[PDB]
Amino acid sequence: ALLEKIEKEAERLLDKDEAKLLILAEKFSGYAPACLLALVRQGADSLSLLIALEILLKVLTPENEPIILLGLKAILEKE
Predict the structure, then answer these.
(1) Gaps in the chain (C–N > 2.5 Å) come after which residues?
(2) Burial code of 15-43, b = ≥16 C-beta within 10 A, e = fewer?
(3) Directed axis angle between helix 46-57 and helix 18-27, to 10°?
(4) Cα–chain center distance at 73
(5) 32: helix, coil or strand?
(6) What is the distance, to the nearest Å, from the Cα of residue 29 to the centroid of all Cα atoms in its chain?
(7) Which of 24, 27, 32, 42 is most buried, judging by how many CB atoms fall within 10 Å of its CB?
(8) Within a 10 A sphere around the Cβ of 67, how many other Cβ atoms?
(9) What is the spatial distance between Cα 2 and Cα 50, in angstroms, rounded to a whole number?
(10) In whole angstroms, what is the distance from residue 36 CA to residue 49 CA?
(11) Are the C-beta atoms of 75 and 46 separated by less than 8 Å?
(12) Is 49 in contact with 39 (CB distance < 8 Å)?
């Protein structure tokens, strides 16, 4: 259920600073899944994604295991 709402709200997060999106995940843990999704849709930097990956892991629900899959795969495209 939430897996489809974290998809929608991240579209509303697609128009924000990468740094700001990192603080949103850090301070608002419930926004962390949508942040990482919005960060890969923006195609952010590897470090930017690794930070959001951390903020998401510490509060990771099994429904966000796909959000991890895309995150890792997007991070991989670096070297």
Answers:
(1) none
(2) eeebeebbebbbeeeebbbbbbbbbbebe
(3) 10
(4) 13
(5) helix
(6) 11
(7) 32
(8) 25
(9) 23
(10) 7
(11) yes
(12) yes
- Is residue 64 within 8 A of residue 40, CB to CB? The reply is no
Query: Rounded to an integer, what distance in angstroms lies between the CA atom of residue 48 and that of residue 63?
Result: 22
Q: List, in order, residues 6 or more apart from 61 with CB less than 8 Å away.
A: 2, 33
Name the one residue in this structure whose structure tokens are 């919005």: 38
Take residue 13 and report the two structure tokens written for it.
């997060």
Tokens of 3: 């897996």
* Cβ-contact 59, 32 below 8 angstroms: yes
Give the integer Cα–Cα distance in Å for 78 and 26: 24
Tell me how many degrees the CA angle 5-7-10 measures, rounded to the nearest 5. Answer: 105
**What's the token pair of residue 74?**
């997007």
Q: Three-class SS of residue 17? A: coil
Residue labelled with tokens 């929608």: 8
